[PDB]
């Protein structure tokens, strides 16, 4: 099952549902009667990294192999913290 | 006092009627040393000539790898303090105790290494017309060294151990010159028969004889007898029972080091230049 | 005239020991002693141990040995028992 | 091992994973599972190179070390709205804001 | 009155081989018989060290630079075991999986002077999270919490 | 629209959020777009640059929830006689509405309250708190009351709506979901306290009327039915945590209150073997704490009476067989009934065994217990070879069944001695029917008692096991001698252990070996001395059974003879002239036994007596019967020794008592060896416990053996003031 995140720029990302339900708020934002979601506050560069973080966290959890560090670019390290607070990821 | 102004205690690592030993650090450089604290020895008392023999031994010997280094000494405030290097490894008395607590025993290569350092140290000491006469598992000290190694986390992963253990001889209090013999009554456990009869002509062989007893005790034998029938049995060229098996050549070396005749026991110069180690 | 063709008999077996009931050892000479029957240890099912005496008097080895240890004199004759 | 890659076309971006043993036609099936399009009209481009069904993902160049989950490899897709094919057109994401004064 | 995280003296030998797998430089710490930690020399990444330690002693493994927590054998806390058949005990060090906030907090902490936190344009109520730096004592208290939690849920 | 703080008016966002929250609470239909939008407004209202408005939002939400709860309470209170269904219907939607609006309120709860934690509680908990404060408690005084009558009518037979009742009951538990110190105390206080008393009071009244109307037998079934009905009603209505409790409240009112009335019937229940009422009576008294001991005692008394009456009037002929069979059949019939009806309770098995122990060991007030002797006779009859003998497997099965009765013997020393005597008498004459049957029977005693019980029997068998090999070795050794002729004699001698074998020669009278077989002795002792080191053998002339008589004659007749008769017959036949007194004492001694054997021979009618008197005198003459005829050429003369004597039983009992003395003394000495200090009652109890397994010793005999040991000086007594027994080595 595939969910669709909408960006403030207009970009639409399509990911697996179980990947998306990792964050607390995005799960809550689908807990009740309100499939597809719509973010009008998050730009494209933040979300194209949030999705990669989802994939990395799901793949490399509870694994015997060594876990490589997540490379966060220093230019977006300030806009990627408000997004982690808001999403409750 | 200079001890309180320049030295900082770290841990108390000794006690007894003799005094105490403390781990100290000096402000000037910060290297870790050991300080021995005691009282003034009485005039015409055994501790007095023990102390003077020890200080003369340090003065003559100087510096060497297998002998614990002397740095400085002084007496103040009714206390006498001496300064030596800090051997972090410990004494064989503690190592054998902790190793026996789990019913575990030393490896034979470690025994060969024990022989290597102790023989080289005794050779160097006897080179200067001196006999230790105070050899025992509590007078042999350990120092540790570390070497890192690399293993590949991904795919194949194999790790190998390569560390070096250094052994040193200390406590030069009983050392007497072969030309001027002043022998203090040694511990009855490791006391050669010749010293028991005050035969002061074959002093270097007594330490060689006690060396094999120390090695056998390190191998895992029961505590050595202090007197009596078992004492005489050991002194008659008979070795105690060992919990583990060992090579027959090394056993022959032990027997020849525990030979009755002092001359027929090999000297340290022969022992150091041996392919068996 | 009477004659004999075939005979039969039943005979027990005992030892050459001159004793009434072994009052000191408080057991029959050929039966198990107090120590053997009380310790319940491994022993022969028929004859545990019989030690013949030089003085023609013999008890069980265990009880006679204990009596010798506690007193060197033989209980029957107040002499030495071997 | 396996690769973790995305498919981008204009405003749309889809995340997926694949095995280098598999061929391109399997990715075509995977993407038409969402796009609801026949595999024949779909045309996959890596950078500026055409991709064919017979070749496998190992042959193209996508390797385990090339596309980690934190650094997926971008793949472009093209459709056919009529009898003729439409050329690729993918626009980049928003330009990052300039580094602030203190963070230097 | 002794803390639960206390070790126990046994004079019991044990041979443990520390292996570093995280790209960040690790720093072992040992909890003494009183309850307070003591550091040790750092291990360069991709290096191993065979060492001698006594059984029952509690080991933790922090970071040299940032002091962020690291997992040993997929566990916060490590304790040796008696050697069997002459095989040393393995104690691997691996990176944990940080949530997106802390992993994004570390970069900001690295790139910003600790005195300039008030200056950056950010939500006002969140510098309270960024101001705190990781320390061993808070982790020790949180680790002691589940002891009483487990003893509560056991009855 | 940046995530960074800005300025937003409270009025418009608050109105929109309140409208959305009201729509959610109403469980109405709300579009997905507004649900998407409200979270952004919540995030805008949570963190701010001027000042956060979380406190104002919390207060407004509390006010709105209070207003909603007040409105719902007023609406439900307005409608009467339908309060329960309205309460259930309102709660069913309020729970879901609260859950949904708490899911919407995740940011405020997750950040603000947990950080801060005028107590602060989460919205999901606040909704339930307000519901219990202003919707449940004020209506409580009604809500429970009508509820319980909807349960009471269920006892009548009419079942109301189960769903509404279950939902109302579960609401009390669901309210306290968030409480962790006491999640079920509120529900307990609101439901269990009055309801338990009400149902307990109702069941007492129901049980009183049911007992008055019906008899005990119908009372039992009706009580069982009511218990079964309550077991279903509790599951239907009550919470799973209380299923037991109410059940208990019934069983302490309907069964426990009439216990005496039950017990007074107990007797008549189980003296008629009623398989119907007893099975329910036992089951219902299992719940009762103290209803079981009366059953145990009464059943034990009934079993004892039945067992005593089963063997009271059995025929004297075939005494042991009937005694064994009756006990076995009684035991089987009772154990099968107990296992079938009473579900095999261990206490009843113990009571049955206790009653059977006294039944088997029944003793007359002045007579001696006859159980061991009868059982020994039974074993002798079954094991002895006879023309009417049966198959071996049936014998083995009979012995296996007999070991059960043998287990009940109180004192097995007398039985052991009697068994040893009978087995010796059997095997000397070779009356055993199978050699392996003896081992099979001995193994049963070995497994029942132990090695000490049958070690004598094992060596008993081993003696004859080795005797055959000894005889074969002697036969082989015969040919070794260069010049030795055995003439006609060819005998087997059974080497036997003196102490182990119970037979002995009470009178010590020397006997003169006949000259015709004198060598038979000497060669045997010389062979034994050569083979064995120092064993001394003693000849027993009381059991010699060698057949000897002339075989070549016009009228041959051969008879089994004893050596005592053999000697006198040889003496008579050797001399052509009969002698009356000089021959009898010149050839043999012990004249009384010789005269008895001569009288027996006269009774056989082999020799005529010239004295013309029934009593043999010293001057009585005899004459060999020239016209003696026998129906069989080869026959056996039946000696009187084969038949026992009650005097021999008296000496057997005396020997058993002496062995009891010896064993008691050894045990007593062992007891001082265990502990130096012994208390009088403690010592008696320890002796009784230690010696109980083998048999039952009496206190007086124990005191007598203790005094005997006092005479042996191994025990020292100081003063007869404080009871203390010191030991001397």
From Swiss-Prot, chain C:
UniProtKB keywords: Acetylation, Cytoplasm, DNA damage, DNA repair, Host-virus interaction, Metal-binding, Nucleus, Phosphoprotein, Transferase, Ubl conjugation pathway, Zinc, Zinc-finger
Zinc finger (RING-type) residue numbers: 33-78
A GO-annotated cellular component: nucleoplasm
Pathway: Protein modification; protein ubiquitination; Protein modification; protein neddylation
Tissue note: Widely expressed.
Binding site for Zn(2+) 2: 33, 36, 48, 62
UniProt domain comment: The RING-type zinc finger domain is essential for ubiquitin ligase activity. It coordinates an additional third zinc ion.
Name the record gives this protein: E3 ubiquitin-protein ligase RBX1
Upper lineage: Eukaryota, Metazoa, Chordata, Craniata, Vertebrata
Swiss-Prot record, chain D:
The organism's place on the tree of life at top rank: Eukaryota
Annotated PANTHER family: ELONGIN B, TRANSCRIPTION ELONGATION FACTOR B POLYPEPTIDE 2
Cellular component annotations (GO), alphabetically ordered: Cul2-RING ubiquitin ligase complex; Cul5-RING ubiquitin ligase complex; cytosol; elongin complex; nucleoplasm; VCB complex
Primary localization: nucleus
Cellular compartment(s): Nucleus
Annotated metabolic or biological route of this protein: Protein modification; protein ubiquitination
Family: Belongs to the Elongin B family.
Record's subunit section: Heterotrimer of an A (ELOA, ELOA2 or ELOA3P), ELOB and ELOC subunit. The elongin BC complex interacts with EPOP; leading to recruit the elongin BC complex to Polycomb group (PcG) target genes, thereby restricting excessive activity of the PRC2/EED-EZH2 complex. (Microbial infection) Following infection by HIV-1 virus, component of a cullin-5-RING E3 ubiquitin-protein ligase complex (ECS complex) hijacked by the HIV-1 Vif protein.
Ubiquitin-like domain segment(s): 1-66
Keyword list, A-Z: Acetylation, Host-virus interaction, Nucleus, Phosphoprotein, Transcription, Transcription regulation, Ubl conjugation pathway
Modification N-acetylmethionine occurs at: 1
PROSITE patterns, A to Z: UBIQUITIN_2
SUPFAM superfamilies on file: Ubiquitin-like
Entry-annotated residues carrying Phosphothreonine: 84
MF (Gene Ontology): transcription corepressor binding; ubiquitin protein ligase binding
Short name of one Pfam family: ubiquitin
Gene3D superfamilies tied to this protein: Phosphatidylinositol 3-kinase Catalytic Subunit, Chain A, domain 1 (3.10.20.90)
A Gene Ontology biological process term: target-directed miRNA degradation
Paired cysteines (S-S): none
This protein's name: Elongin-B
Swiss-Prot record, chain E:
Region Involved in binding to CCT complex: start-end pairs: 42-97
A GO molecular function held by the record: ubiquitin-protein transferase activity
Free-text tissue specificity from the UniProt record: Expressed in the adult and fetal brain and kidney.
Source domain of life: Eukaryota
Keyword Magnesium assigned: no
Outcome recorded upon mutating residue 109 to G: In VHLD; type I-II
Outcome recorded upon mutating residue 104 to W: In VHLD; type I-II
Outcome when changing residue 117 to D: In VHLD; type I
Effect of residue 57 to Y: In VHLD; type I
Effect the entry attributes to changing residue 56 to C: In VHLD; type II
Medical condition linked: Pheochromocytoma: A catecholamine-producing tumor of chromaffin tissue of the adrenal medulla or sympathetic paraganglia. The cardinal symptom, reflecting the increased secretion of epinephrine and norepinephrine, is hypertension, which may be persistent or intermittent. von Hippel-Lindau disease: VHLD is a dominantly inherited familial cancer syndrome predisposing to a variety of malignant and benign neoplasms, most frequently retinal, cerebellar and spinal hemangioblastoma, renal cell carcinoma (RCC), pheochromocytoma, and pancreatic tumors. VHL type 1 is without pheochromocytoma, type 2 is with pheochromocytoma.
Note on domains (UniProt): The Elongin BC complex binding domain is also known as BC-box with the consensus [APST]-L-x(3)-C-x(3)-[AILV].
Protein name: von Hippel-Lindau disease tumor suppressor
Interval of the full protein contained in this chain: 59 to 213 of 213
Swiss-Prot record, chain F:
Residues modified to Phosphothreonine: 645
Covalent cross-link Glycyl lysine isopeptide (Lys-Gly) (interchain with G-Cter in NEDD8), where: 673
Domain of life: Eukaryota
Domain Cullin neddylation: 659-719
Subcellular location: Nucleus
Pfam families: Cullin, Cullin_Nedd8
Role noted for this protein: Core component of multiple cullin-RING-based ECS (ElonginB/C-CUL2/5-SOCS-box protein) E3 ubiquitin-protein ligase complexes, which mediate the ubiquitination of target proteins. CUL2 serves as a rigid scaffold in the complex and may contribute to catalysis through positioning of the substrate and the E2 ubiquitin-conjugating enzyme. The E3 ubiquitin-protein ligase activity of the complex is dependent on the neddylation of the cullin subunit and is inhibited by the association of the deneddylated cullin subunit with TIP120A/CAND1.
Record remark: domains: The Cullin neddylation domain restrains the RING domain of RBX1 in the E3 ubiquitin-protein ligase complex; this restraint is removed upon neddylation of the cullin.
Name the UniProt record assigns to this protein: Cullin-2
Lineage of the species this protein comes from: Eukaryota, Metazoa, Chordata, Craniata, Vertebrata
């Amino acid at each position: 099952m595939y969910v669709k995140l909408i960006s403030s720029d207009g970009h639409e990302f399509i990911v697996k549902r179980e990947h998306a339900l990792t964050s607390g708020t995005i799960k809550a934002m689908l807990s009740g009667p309100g499939n597809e979601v719509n973010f009008r506050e998050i730009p494209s560069h933040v979300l194209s990294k949030v999705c990669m973080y989802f994939t990395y966290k799901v793949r490399y959890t509870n694994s015997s192999t060594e876990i490589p560090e997540f490379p966060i670019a220093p230019e977006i390290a300030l806009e990627l913290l408000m997004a982690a607070n808001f999403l409750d990821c | 006092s200079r001890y309180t102004t320049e030295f900082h205690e770290l841990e108390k690592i000794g006690s007894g009627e003799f005094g105490s030993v403390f781990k100290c650090v000096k402000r000037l450089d910060g290297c870790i040393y050991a300080i021995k604290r005691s009282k003034k020895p009485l005039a015409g008392s055994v501790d007095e000539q023990n102390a003077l023999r020890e200080v003369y031994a340090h003065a003559v010997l100087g510096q060497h790898s297998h002998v614990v280094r002397y740095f400085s000494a002084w007496a103040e405030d009714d206390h006498m303090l001496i300064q030596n290097e800090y051997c972090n490894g410990g004494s064989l008395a503690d190592a054998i105790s902790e190793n026996y607590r789990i019913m575990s025993y030393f490896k034979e290569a470690e025994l060969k290494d024990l022989l290597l350092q102790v023989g080289r140290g005794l050779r160097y000491i006897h080179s200067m017309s001196l006999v230790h006469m105070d050899i025992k598992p509590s007078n042999i000290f350990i120092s540790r060294t570390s070497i890192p190694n690399a293993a590949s986390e991904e795919g194949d992963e194999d790790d190998w151990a390569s560390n070096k253990v250094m052994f040193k001889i200390g406590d030069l209090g009983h050392v007497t010159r072969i030309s001027s013999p002043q022998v203090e009554e040694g511990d009855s456990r490791f006391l050669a028969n010749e010293v028991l009869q005050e035969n002061y002509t074959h002093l270097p062989k007594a330490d060689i004889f006690a060396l094999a007893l120390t090695v056998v005790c390190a191998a895992g034998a029961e505590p050595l007898p202090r007197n009596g029938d078992q004492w005489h049995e050991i002194r008659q060229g008979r070795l105690p029972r060992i919990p583990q098996v060992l090579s027959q050549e090394f056993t022959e070396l032990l027997k020849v080091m525990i030979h009755p005749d002092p001359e027929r026991r090999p000297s340290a110069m022969a022992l150091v230049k041996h392919s068996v180690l | 005239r009477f004659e004999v063709k075939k005979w039969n008999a039943v005979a027990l077996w005992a030892w050459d020991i001159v004793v009434d009931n072994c009052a000191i050892c408080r057991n029959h000479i050929m039966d198990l002693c107090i120590e053997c029957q009380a310790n319940q240890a491994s022993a022969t099912s028929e004859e545990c141990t019989v030690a013949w005496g030089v003085c023609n008097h013999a008890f069980h080895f265990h009880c006679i040995s204990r009596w010798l240890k506690t007193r060197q004199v033989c209980p029957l004759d107040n002499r030495e028992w071997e | 091992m396996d690769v973790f890659l995305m498919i981008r076309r204009h405003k749309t971006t889809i995340f997926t994973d694949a095995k280098e043993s598999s061929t391109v036609f399997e990715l075509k099936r995977i993407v038409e599972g969402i796009l609801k399009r026949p595999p024949d009209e779909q045309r996959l481009y890596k950078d500026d190179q055409l991709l064919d069904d017979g070749k496998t993902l190992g042959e193209c160049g996508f390797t385990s070390q090339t596309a980690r989950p934190q650094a997926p490899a971008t793949v472009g897709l093209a459709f056919r709205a009529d009898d003729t094919f439409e050329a690729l057109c993918i626009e980049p994401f928003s330009s990052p804001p300039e580094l602030p004064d203190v963070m230097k | 009155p002794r803390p639960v995280l206390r070790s126990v003296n046994s004079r019991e030998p044990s041979q443990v081989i520390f292996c570093n797998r995280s790209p960040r430089v690790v720093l072992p710490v040992w909890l003494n018989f009183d309850g307070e930690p003591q550091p040790y020399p750092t291990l360069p990444p991709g290096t191993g060290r065979r060492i001698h330690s006594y059984r029952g002693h509690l080991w933790l493994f922090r970071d040299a630079g940032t002091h962020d927590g690291l997992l040993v054998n997929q566990t916060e806390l490590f304790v040796p075991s008696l050697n069997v058949d002459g095989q040393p005990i393995f104690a691997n060090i691996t990176l944990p999986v940080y949530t997106l906030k802390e992993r994004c907090l570390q970069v900001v902490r690295s790139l910003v002077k600790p005195e300039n936190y008030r200056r950056l344009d950010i939500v006002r109520s969140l510098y309270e999270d960024l101001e705190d730096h990781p320390n061993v004592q808070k982790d020790l208290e949180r680790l002691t919490q589940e002891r009483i939690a487990h003893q509560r849920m056991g009855d | 629209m940046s995530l960074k703080p800005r300025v937003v008016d409270f009025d418009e966002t608050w109105n929109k959020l309140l409208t959305t929250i009201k729509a959610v609470v109403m469980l109405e239909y709300v579009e997905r777009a507004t649900w998407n939008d409200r979270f952004s407004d919540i995030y805008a209202l949570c963190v701010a640059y001027p000042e956060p408005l979380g406190e104002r939002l919390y207060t407004e939400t509390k006010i709105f929830l209070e207003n909603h709860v007040r409105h719902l309470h007023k609406r439900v209170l307005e409608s009467e006689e339908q309060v329960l269904v309205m309460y259930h219907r309102y709660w069913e939607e309020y729970s879901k509405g609260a859950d949904y609006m708490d899911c919407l309120y995740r940011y405020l709860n997750t950040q603000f309250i947990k950080k801060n934690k005028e107590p602060l509680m989460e919205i999901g908990e606040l909704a339930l708190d307000m519901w219990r404060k202003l919707m449940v408690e004020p209506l409580q005084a009604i809500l429970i009351r009508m509820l319980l009558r909807e349960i009471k009518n269920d006892r009548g037979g009419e079942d109301p709506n189960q769903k509404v009742i279950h939902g109302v009951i579960n609401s009390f538990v669901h309210v306290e979901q968030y409480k962790k110190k006491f999640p079920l105390k509120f529900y307990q206080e609101i439901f269990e306290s009055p309801f338990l008393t009400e149902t307990g009071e109702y069941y007492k009244q129901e049980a009183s009327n049911l007992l008055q109307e019906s008899n005990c037998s119908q009372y039992m079934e009706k009580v069982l039915g009511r218990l079964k009905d309550e077991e279903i009603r509790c599951r239907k209505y009550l919470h799973p945590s209380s299923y037991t409790k109410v059940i208990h409240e019934c069983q302490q009112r309907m069964v426990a209150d009439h216990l005496q009335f039950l017990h007074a019937e107990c007797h008549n229940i189980i003296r008629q073997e009623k398989k119907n009422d007893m099975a329910n009576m036992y089951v219902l008294l299992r719940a009762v704490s103290t209803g079981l001991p009366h059953m145990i005692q009464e059943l034990q008394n009934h079993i004892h009476d039945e067992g005593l009456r089963a063997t009271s009037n059995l025929t004297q002929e075939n005494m042991p067989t009937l005694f064994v069979e009756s006990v076995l059949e009684v035991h089987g019939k009772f154990v099968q009934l107990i296992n079938t009806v009473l579900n095999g309770d261990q206490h009843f098995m113990s009571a049955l065994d206790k009653a059977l122990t006294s039944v088997v060991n029944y003793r007359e007030p002045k007579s001696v217990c006859k159980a061991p002797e009868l059982l020994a006779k039974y074993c002798d009859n079954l094991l002895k070879k006879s023309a009417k003998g049966m198959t071996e497997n049936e014998v083995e099965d009979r012995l296996t069944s007999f070991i059960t009765v043998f287990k009940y013997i109180d004192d097995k020393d007398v039985f052991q001695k009697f068994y040893a005597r009978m087995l010796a008498k059997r095997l000397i004459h070779g009356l055993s029917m199978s050699m392996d049957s003896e081992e099979a029977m001995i193994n049963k005693l070995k497994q029942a008692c132990g090695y000490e019980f049958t070690s004598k029997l094992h060596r008993m068998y081993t003696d004859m096991s080795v005797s055959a090999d000894l005889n074969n070795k002697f036969n082989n050794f015969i040919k070794n001698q260069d010049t030795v002729i055995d003439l006609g004699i060819s005998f087997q001698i059974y080497v036997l252990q003196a102490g182990a074998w119970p037979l002995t020669q009470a009178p010590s009278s020397t006997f003169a070996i006949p000259q015709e077989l004198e060598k038979s002795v000497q060669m045997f002792e010389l062979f034994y001395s050569q083979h064995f080191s120092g064993r001394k053998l003693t000849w027993l002339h009381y059991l010699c059974t060698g057949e000897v008589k002339m075989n070549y004659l016009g009228k041959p007749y051969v008879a089994m003879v004893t050596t005592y008769q053999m000697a006198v017959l040889l003496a008579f036949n050797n001399s052509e002239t009969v002698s009356y007194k000089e021959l009898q004492d010149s050839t043999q001694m012990n004249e009384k036994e010789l005269t008895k054997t001569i009288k027996s021979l006269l009774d056989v009618k082999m020799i005529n007596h010239d004295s013309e008197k029934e009593d043999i005198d010293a001057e009585s003459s005899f004459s060999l019967n020239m016209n003696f005829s026998s129906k069989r050429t080869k026959f056996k003369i039946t000696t009187s020794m084969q038949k026992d004597t009650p005097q021999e039983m008296e000496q057997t009992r005396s020997a058993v008592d002496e062995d009891r003395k010896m064993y008691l003394q050894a045990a007593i000495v062992r007891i001082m060896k265990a502990r130096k200090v012994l208390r009088h009652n403690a010592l008696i109890q320890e002796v009784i416990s230690q010696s109980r397994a083998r048999f039952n010793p009496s206190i007086s005999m124990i005191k007598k053996c203790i005094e005997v040991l006092i005479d042996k000086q191994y025990i020292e007594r100081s003063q007869a003031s404080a009871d203390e027994y010191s030991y001397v080595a």
